[PDB]
């Protein structure tokens, strides 16, 4: 190739009849997300899936956007990023992915804030940095990293999702340059707000905000502040406050993610190293009341699988990460 390398990802087209036990997880204006089982024909496996569709097929912009999302999700393969299993070409286009049964990490940290210890928080920071370093290696800028877009496979294992705003940087390209559209201002780097510049280092800013969401057990960044004021606040040099549990070691890493010079911010590879060091002595880096005694569900637990799956299905249930095709 003269430009970037050829994208040889396989897009699997999935028959509607391979999907069973469809139940709504959530809805909005644009569309609906369901849980279900995918039973590829004659394989003897049942795969828990999330299924996303648009409500209607009457917005060229929306149809193009969901197929752009499918293109990005089909093109990724890393343990800390969610991959597309395939698409179903019903009246609506439907995107199919591995079910993450504990939901998004934002709601998880809110719902379980009294049972989340320092080891879980630092390990999640490592895992998100690994996922984002992989996306950087693939020249993807995510543009919507937030705790709402990190999903929980198990309490021990999280993955980045929601590639609806993601963009591929060309071979020698350094910055994406957008125009218009809905934007999550409270996670954006200042250069993204001012000048629509997006880079891996603008995702590092959003990672800093994501870590702040986790460390405050899912607090809203800049709560009560209107979106239109955020650029002015940031230009004055204001930033999100130090979370109560954070040592200066942890908070300084967040503050470095929010520096004006994007190239002075940490790289994702460095964030992996620093959070990994801290995860080896987590109580030196986060101060949580009662931390020593805390525990969360593990795949070893009796009703771990039974909580999700019906017992009628469980003999042939396979997690999609173990369902591998050539
Ligand atoms: C975007 C992404 N979403 C998922 N991918 C995988 N597993 C999911 C599992 C659950 C959920 C989930 C969805 N809505 C709500 Cl309201 C909740 N509730 S909670 C627990 O409070 O967060 C969980 C989403 C999932 C996807 C990409 C492509 C296709 C299909 C879904
Ligand atoms: Cl919220």
Numbering used by the authors: 694 to 1019
What does the article say, verbatim?
Here we evaluated the pharmacological profile of MTX-531 that was computationally designed to selectively target two key resistance drivers, epidermal growth factor receptor and phosphatidylinositol 3-OH kinase (PI3K). MTX-531 exhibits low-nanomolar potency against both targets with a high degree of specificity predicted by cocrystal structural analyses. Here, we show that MTX-531 acts as a weak agonist of peroxisome proliferator-activated receptor-γ, an attribute that likely mitigates hyperglycemia induced by PI3K inhibition. The reversed binding mode of the quinazoline core between EGFR and PI3Kγ was an important element in the design of MTX-531, which shows low-nanomolar potency against both of its intended targets.
We leveraged this flipped binding mode of the quinazoline core between EGFR and PI3Kγ to computationally design potent and selective dual inhibitors of both enzyme families. X-ray crystal structures of EGFR and PI3Kγ cocomplexed with MTX-531 confirmed the postulated reversed binding mode of MTX-531 to each target. The 1-position of the quinazoline ring in MTX-531 forms a key hydrogen bond with the backbone amide of M793 of EGFR. The substitution at the 4-position fits into a hydrophobic pocket formed by the aliphatic side chains of K745 and T790, whereas the hydrophilic group at the 6-position faces outward to a solvent-accessible area of EGFR. All studies described here were carried out with the (R)-isomer, which is ~100-fold more potent against EGFR and ~10-fold less potent against PI3K than the (S)-isomer. Collectively, the observed binding mode is consistent with these isomeric potency differences. The methyl substituent of MTX-531 in the (S)-isomer is oriented toward a sterically restricted area of EGFR, thus hindering binding. MTX-531 exhibits low-nanomolar potency against purified EGFR and PI3Kα with half-maximal inhibitory concentration (IC50) values of 15 nM and 6.4 nM, respectively. Only four of 432 kinases tested were found to exhibit an IC50 < 1 μM and none came within tenfold of MTX-531’s on-target potency against EGFR (IC50 ≈ 15 nM).
